[PDB]
Design a binder for these strands. Structure first.
Lengths: 553, 553
DNA sequence: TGCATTTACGGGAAACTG
DNA sequence: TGCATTTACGGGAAACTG
């Protein structure tokens, strides 16, 4: 809450206060050297027409006061550095991690307003300290003498003030929204050669003499040593309009921003790399956008510069799945050190950290993430029976390496289930009708429940296209549980034709010449089908109407 | 058969024969002026060391023989013109119509070999007649005299021979295969901005001193006055490599050809036309490819030139349907006169001519066209109860203008039915299982047939997506026909999910608590379902198998 | 020879301009 | 304001190159 923000805030007032205060002192000193000027100039020349002593004791004040002014700036400057350290190395830093996490889903990041505020106040305050060092520069360029407080102090001061300004502005230039294809908005750090994508820069030092002044140019792979060292490294060029100029309009509430839309990548086919497909890493190489600009002024010439988070580049949305797998692993095990050679030695993740991201994956796309018992199932797929919250899942295991006995990788498996929910199960998923992930051993051991006529909804473990199922329980006459019963899993092909509610409503089980049955009374504990799936059912010389319907035996 | 071909052929021998024959005569004359030369030259100068008369009577022969030579070429030339008329204005002409018809489906066109033959023989023969006019040019450039048969004849002859050659070669240059997108091979005169398409030129005068000599360049809309006169006329540019050179290799069996692949159109967005969408004609404007080249030689400089059939240009295969509608109507009511302003006043077609094309539409895509009773149904849709084979179907009626009461045009309706067969009904269509087109009045009046358990397959008349149905007959107890019965039509959406054979195999009709029925015993006259659709049916701790199935009530 | 990655095109939907 | 035509992108399959 206001744990730091209050502290921090406090300090920024402190600066602002000190700067005014200098500013009186400068006036009063701007007076007293005049007053002297007047009285001296009438008294130096005088005889052209009871002690006292004005000239000897009073002069003193043209010393005293200047000393007090000079020493007093120095105190301000020293403070300002403390402040500026707190604000650049904690405050901003923290926001940027917070944003890293927003990208792979996770708690949404706060606005850049509060920050923009501090940054701008401390950046105004310096600017004022700039001018007074020039007003004192003036007084010296009136009157000077043996030891002139403002002749020893002049250059060190000037140099500090600018040193400070420079660090300050440099740090403000920041990627307010990282690169993204519009047609893929939950998937923001993967690009495809061809499609257009958007970036937003933003400066935090909202002055008004920086309006239509800064011209940002975009670059790509600039200074990436992995072009020479890594065999097979692709190369590209940005197509759209790069240069934009950064302006207060457009984005509301000030914000001195620049929102590129219409940017594109194209590969640089030049043989060259010769696309060695026997190299170090598949297309999970990371590549980096860069932005550049420069703040030109009377006596000022600041180069700015920054960098998106590492990006992945693909050709075909076929790849996107595996592509997002790489952006997860990096924005989860890396603080920012742009480690474009990360996948050469990709470290292991702890189960405790994995799980909360796996959850984020569903919470972002739907309206409900992965509960506890669910997670324990995927726990055990990766980790074994002993699924401690410390266990280490290696990057092979999560992504390129078949599960226990199957012909697919684990991440590809979830990725499909996730795609199925998105386009055929949202309503049932939002509303908690689906258990989804549950072992076919704890699923029996929870169906010695009730009325021979209860059924769960699972996700097939054996598919690759991602596929829902259902299981129910009978009475076998032996005085015990049934073998229980599950139907071959409904994938997209069936589901496209009739809905999964409609399937359930009307399933039959048939014979030769027997009235056909309907063995689905109860959803999980006790819910009568036509209440659980009530609201999702569709609808309730003269063609006769038909329905599709799924049937067994 | 060999009705003309024999005649024609005959004549071409005639030419070839005459040319040899000249050729002896030229030799024997090439001798007799020598012989004279020898005897004269010994006798002119003689005294430097019984009558007779050699010099006076014999000389005569240097006249006689030359006269006979000269007159004799003239006979050849005169003949050759007759031949060349027959071959250019009937023979070629006919082939080209034959090809026009191949494009909208129809009897496949013969090879260009036979033609290539004639063309080449008559084109060799001239070439020889070229040379002898130069061998006689020589004899004159030996010896001459009062009336020299070959001084009056020299220029007229020379000029004729070339006049002839020129017409001959000009006519050979011909579009052996008209433009087409590979991904759309039954639809060859419609192009889409973006896709690549192919053309083949071919010359018919297969000489060997025209190999890597002729460089064909492609053009587009060249000399099309409908760019200035017609408001809204689009414009374009060919992208790929235009110039190709025409070579004997590549295409086997000689053939001096040039097969462009990789050609593309792009619109010329330049405002300009300003895309007035209140002009004369929708995108059914016709546009024309042109080919050009030039046959450069010692003393010869022939410009060649030709033109594809009019083409239609679209943006999106959405349009292709209506697009093909325009290519049908033109290659059916127009002999070739490139009437790019045809759709401004589009004439009416007679039912007799329509029908055979409508048939061609199915015969081309499947393996069976439209029988007689079928045609009579579409007869009556367009024409009325009185569907004479002379009735006039106007172009509105066939294409842009709703049917009697419906919300679609007739051609769009067939176009859909046609698309349905192509991707879900081929086998049943090939094998005559489907009546398809039959009025819902003659369909009752042919189902007071038999065992309450017969059913046809129709095509819905009310769809727009194109949709099959089935109807069957009962027994009502009243001692007469049933109301009969038809199911709401199965379109692509159902059909994609389960097949139309599988539908039929298992349809049920259901109740609350009654065993469900199967009212489809017999296909049309008497065929037991499971024989008619026998061969098309699919197939005949442990998931339990299901099926989709269509059900009524 | 096989697998990985990229291209090319169809179809659907949104965007554009008259 | 509405309709026609074109663009932009996803997904599937073929083509390419190591």
């Amino acid at each position: 809450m206001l744990d730091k923000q209050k502290e921090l805030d406090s300090k920024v007032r402190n600066v602002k206060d000190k700067v005014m205060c200098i500013e009186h002192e400068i006036k009063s000193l701007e007076d007293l050297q005049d007053e002297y000027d007047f009285k001296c100039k009438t008294l130096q020349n005088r005889e052209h027409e009871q002690e006292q002593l004005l000239l000897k004791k009073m002069y003193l004040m043209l010393d005293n006061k200047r000393k007090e002014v000079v020493h007093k700036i120095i105190e301000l400057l020293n403070v300002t550095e403390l402040t500026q350290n707190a604000l650049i190395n904690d405050e901003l830093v923290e926001w940027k991690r917070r944003q890293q996490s927003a990208c792979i889903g996770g708690p949404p990041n706060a606005c850049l307003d509060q920050l923009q505020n501090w940054f701008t106040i401390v950046a105004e305050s310096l600017q004022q300290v700039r001018q007074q060092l020039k007003k004192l520069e003036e007084l010296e360029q009136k009157y000077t003498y043996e030891h002139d407080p403002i002749t020893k102090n002049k250059q060190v001061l000037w140099d500090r003030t600018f040193s400070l300004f420079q660090q300050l502005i440099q740090s403000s230039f920041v990627v307010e929204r990282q690169p993204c294809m519009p047609t893929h908005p939950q998937r923001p750090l993967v690009l495809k050669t061809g499609v257009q994508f958007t970036v937003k820069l933003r400066l935090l030092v909202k002055l008004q003499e920086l309006n239509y002044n800064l011209k940002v140019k975009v670059l790509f792979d600039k200074d990436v040593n992995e072009r020479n060292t890594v065999k097979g490294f692709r190369k590209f060029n940005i197509l759209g309009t790069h240069t934009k100029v950064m302006n207060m309009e457009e984005s509301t509430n000030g914000s001195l921003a620049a929102e590129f839309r219409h940017l594109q990548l194209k590969e640089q086919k030049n043989a060259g790399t010769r696309t060695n497909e026997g190299p170090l890493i598949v297309t999970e190489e990371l590549h980096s956008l860069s932005f550049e600009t420069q703040l030109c002024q009377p006596g000022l010439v600041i180069d700015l510069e920054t960098t998106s988070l590492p990006v992945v580049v693909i050709s075909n949305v076929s790849q996107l799945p595996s592509g997002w797998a790489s952006i997860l692993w990096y924005n989860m095990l890396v603080a920012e050190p742009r480690n474009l050679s990360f996948f050469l030695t990709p470290p292991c993740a702890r189960w405790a950290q994995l799980s909360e991201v796996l959850s984020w994956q569903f919470s972002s796309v739907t309206k409900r993430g992965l509960n506890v018992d669910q997670l324990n199932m995927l726990g055990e797929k990766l980790l074994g029976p002993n699924a401690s919250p410390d266990g280490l899942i290696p990057w092979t295991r999560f992504c390129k390496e078949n599960i226990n006995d199957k012909n697919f990788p684990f991440w590809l498996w979830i990725e499909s289930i996730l795609e199925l929910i998105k386009k055929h199960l949202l309503p049932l998923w939002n509303d908690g009708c689906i258990m989804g992930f549950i072992s076919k051993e704890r699923e029996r051991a929870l169906l010695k429940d009730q009325q021979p006529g209860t059924f769960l909804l699972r996700f097939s473990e054996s598919s690759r296209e991602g596929a829902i199922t259902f299981t129910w329980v009978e009475r076998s006459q032996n005085g015990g549980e049934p073998d229980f019963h599950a139907v071959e899993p409904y994938t997209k092909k069936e589901l496209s034709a009739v809905t999964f509610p409609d399937i359930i409503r009307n399933y039959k089980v048939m014979a030769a010449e027997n009235i056909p049955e309907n063995p689905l009374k109860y959803l999980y504990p006790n819910i009568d089908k036509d209440h659980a799936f009530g609201k999702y059912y569709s609808r309730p010389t003269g063609y006769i109407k038909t329905e599709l319907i799924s049937v067994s035996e």
